[PDB]
C-alpha cells in the first residue's frame, strides 16, 4: 500500500485504481494523470471514495478530505480541502507519455513506439501493461469442444457461439482439459499435442492465459565503460578459428553490456561460443526467447566446449522436444543454456542473449531480474523478425521499436557488426545488403548462378485470413520437373495455408519465413503468395531469401521487391 512513484520514484500512498497495473503515483504526478485521463479512481490504504452511506462518487476530482475521511461535494463537512488542489492529490509524503501508455489499447504502432522512446521506468510500466492487455484479450476468444476424432493427427472442432475464433497456426498454443498443450492447422483440422493422449469427443481447449508478474529490473542496466578487461581472464592460446573475434571479445570485457548486429550467416553462433574459449574460466549463461535459438547455441557449444560443464535448463512443464545431449537442469554447470521464461535466479561472468530482435522489453527486464552478471552480450539483427505483437493491427512496427537493444542498434549503431555473409550466394548477399544493411554486408561466396526470380501474381484465395496462391505453387511444380536438383528444396512462404497446399502438391518440407529464421537450406523455394504489408515486410523478405546456401527460386507478387532481387529472371 506504500510504494514508489513510477515516474519520479517519490514515495507515496497513491496507486491509480484505473490503470490495469495499479502503479504508485506521487501527489504531483497522480494529479497530472487524473486531470487529463478518464482515470479518476485513486487508491491509498483505503480507496478515495465518498464515505457517506450509499454514495457512488469515486472520481478523485469530485472528493474532499472531511477530517480524516473522504466525501463528495454533496456530503463534505464545512471544513474540507478538495483532494485535487494546486497540481496535487492529497496522500502522504507530499506524464503526457505515462497517460498515453496507461490508456492505450496497444492496437496502434505509435503505442509500441512510445513504449520504447520513453524513460526506463516507463518502459517497464509499458511492458507490464502490454503483456497484461495481451493476456486479458486471450479470454475474449471462444472455447473449442471436439465433435469427432478422425485419427491420431486429425479431428472436427465445435467452436463457441458469439465469441471469435483464434487463428489456427503454431503461434496460438491451446491447453486441453489438464491433458497438456495442443496446436492446430487447416471440415478436417490437424491436431498436434505436447502429450500423446487419446483425444476424446467432448474434451475442450482454451488458450493458456498466464498471470503477468511485475517487472523490477531495467531492460538495459546502465552502461559502464572500463579501461581494462573487468572480471574476465583471456587466453594467450586462442585457436586461429576465433582469431577474427579477439578485438570484439576484448570490447565485451571493457563494457557492462555490448550489442552485436550479425546479418544472416555472419558468425553469431561462432562468436557466442568463441567468447567461452577466449574467457575459458568465465561462467556463461546462454539465453534466448525460443527453445530453437537455445538449442542452436547448444549444437555450437557441443562442437567446441566440454560436454561435462554444459547444462540445458528444461522447465518441468515440457512444451516441445529440446536439446538432449547435455546434463538437464544442473543450474551450477559453467555453461547454462536456457529460454528466458525458465531462467533461474543466479549470477554469471558473461550472459549472452541471442536472437535479440525476437525479444520484448518484458524479456529484456526478466533477464536483468534473474541474472546478475559482470558482462551482458546482446546478439541478433534488427533487420530480421521481431516477436509477434498479437494486439497490433494498425501501422508497422519499425526495427528501432522492437526493444531497447534494437533501438540502440538502429540509433547509435551496434558495438560490433559481423559484415561478411559466409552462407549465401552473392546474388542474395548483394540484394539484402542494399535492402536493409546500407550496402555494408559483404559476400564471401561467389554468385551461385542458381538464384531465380519470377514475377507471377497468380490468384489469391484465403483460408480465413491466411492466404493461398495455387497458381504460384503450379509454376513451382513446373520448375521442379525441369530442375530435379531442387527436389531437396525447402518450400517457404509468409502463410501457413499456402505452405499446407504446397506440402500436399509439391511434397517439399515447408517453413513460414518466421519459423525459418536461424535455419539454413541448400535450396529454397519462396512464393510471396500475396502483395500485402505482411508479405512485403523487408525484414521478413530479408530472412526468407538468406535461408539459402546454394540456390533460391522466388515467385514474387510485388513489383518493388521483384525488381530489387539481383537474380536471373525466369519466363512462363
Ligand atoms: Zn491510470
Ligand atoms: Zn511522481
Ligand atoms: Zn457523496
Swiss-Prot record:
Domain of life: Viruses
Binding site for Zn(2+) 11: 5, 8, 26, 29
Start and end residues of each (+)RNA virus helicase ATP-binding domain: 237-418
Record's catalysed reaction(s): ATP + H2O = ADP + phosphate + H(+)
Ranges for domain (+)RNA virus helicase C-terminal: 419-572
Subcellular location: Host endoplasmic reticulum-Golgi intermediate compartment
Domain CV ZBD, residue spans: 1-105
Binding of Zn(2+) 13, residues: 50, 55, 72, 75
LRR repeat boundaries on the chain: 208-228
Residues that bind Zn(2+) 12: 16, 19, 33, 39
Residues where a ribonucleoside 5'-triphosphate binds: 262-269
Phenotype when changing residue 409 to I: In strain: Kappa/B.1.617.1
Effect of residue 399 to S: In strain: Mu/B.1.621
Subunit structure comment from the entry: Interacts with nsp8 to form the replication-transcription complex (RTC): nsp12, nsp7, two subunits of nsp8, and up to two subunits of nsp13. Interacts with host TBK1; this interaction inhibits TBK1 phosphorylation and decreases by 75% IRF3 phosphorylation, which leads to reduced IFN-beta production.
Function according to Swiss-Prot or TrEMBL: Plays a role in viral RNA synthesis. Multi-functional protein with a zinc-binding domain in N-terminus displaying RNA and DNA duplex-unwinding activities with 5' to 3' polarity. Activity of helicase is dependent on magnesium. Binds to host TBK1 and inhibits TBK1 phosphorylation; the interaction with TBK1 decreases IRF3 phosphorylation, which leads to reduced IFN-beta production.
Protein name per its UniProtKB record: Helicase nsp13
